[PDB]
């Protein structure tokens, strides 16, 4: 359950034209191995990012009816090329393509797309209607921080997607220990969770170890200009 829309001869340029951006990778029919797995993670990861993406993938058939083919052609790839990555900006007319020497991996995925676009594609954790709000918040005054645990509090109970209702609880937290104790907390919390990082971890508990590591560093800032 990935999320990339297969395109074929009658259904790509249609789909593209109705979408503000489209990634499409371009390789064999019924592909497979880590580029593939790469791009697939690439895929779950921009659809918890944003609404205006089309993620999407193009078969080339050699042997056979020859099925698109044609499409390959267009854009003046082969077997020889696969995979090839290129990005839409609404219509099939205009393209970039990455680069043939960069590694499809899903860091490279994401770069690419806000290098070459207006699209955010957040860390792992974050929620951008939060961050929105919350820049500097460790130095505002006492006031406006209460104001903000209750407004963002507000919207935590409207959250109707079970892994943003999961991040917005770590946010309260350290909004709620940052307002009690002060910049102070900041480097509590990061020796906690780099003690937990550091020791004998599996790959499911490292990535949500990173998690409430991007949720947090939304709190740093870059003097402390608050008493206390």
Same mark, same amino acid.
């Given at each position: 359950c990935t999320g990339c829309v297969d395109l074929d001869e009658l259904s790509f340029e249609k789909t593209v034209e109705r979408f503000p951006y489209s990634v499409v990778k371009f390789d064999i029919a019924f592909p497979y191995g880590e580029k593939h797995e790469a791009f697939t993670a690439f895929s779950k990861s921009a659809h918890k990012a944003t609404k205006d993406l089309l993620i999407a993938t193009v078969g080339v058939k &050699?042997?056979?009816?020859?099925?698109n083919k044609a499409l390959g052609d267009r854009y003046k790839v082969d077997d020889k090329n696969f995979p090839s990555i290129f990005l839409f900006?609404?219509?099939? &007319?205009e393209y970039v393509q990455l680069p043939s020497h960069v590694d499809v991996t899903l860091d490279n995925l994401k770069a690419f797309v806000s290098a070459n676009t207006p699209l955010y594609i957040g860390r792992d954790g974050c929620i951008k209607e939060f961050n929105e709000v919350l820049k500097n918040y460790a130095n505002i005054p006492d006031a406006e921080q209460l104001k903000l645990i209750e407004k963002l509090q507000a919207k935590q109970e409207q959250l109707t997607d079970p892994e943003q209702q999961q991040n917005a609880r770590a946010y309260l937290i350290y909004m709620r220990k940052i307002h009690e104790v002060g910049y102070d907390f900041l480097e509590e919390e990061t020796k906690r969770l780099l003690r937990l990082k550091a020791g004998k971890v599996t790959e499911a508990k490292k990535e949500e170890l990173l998690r409430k590591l991007n949720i947090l560093?939304?709190?740093?800032?870059?003097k402390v200009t608050k008493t206390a």
């Open positions: &050699d042997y056979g009816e020859l099925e900006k609404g219509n099939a &007319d560093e939304v709190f740093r800032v870059h």
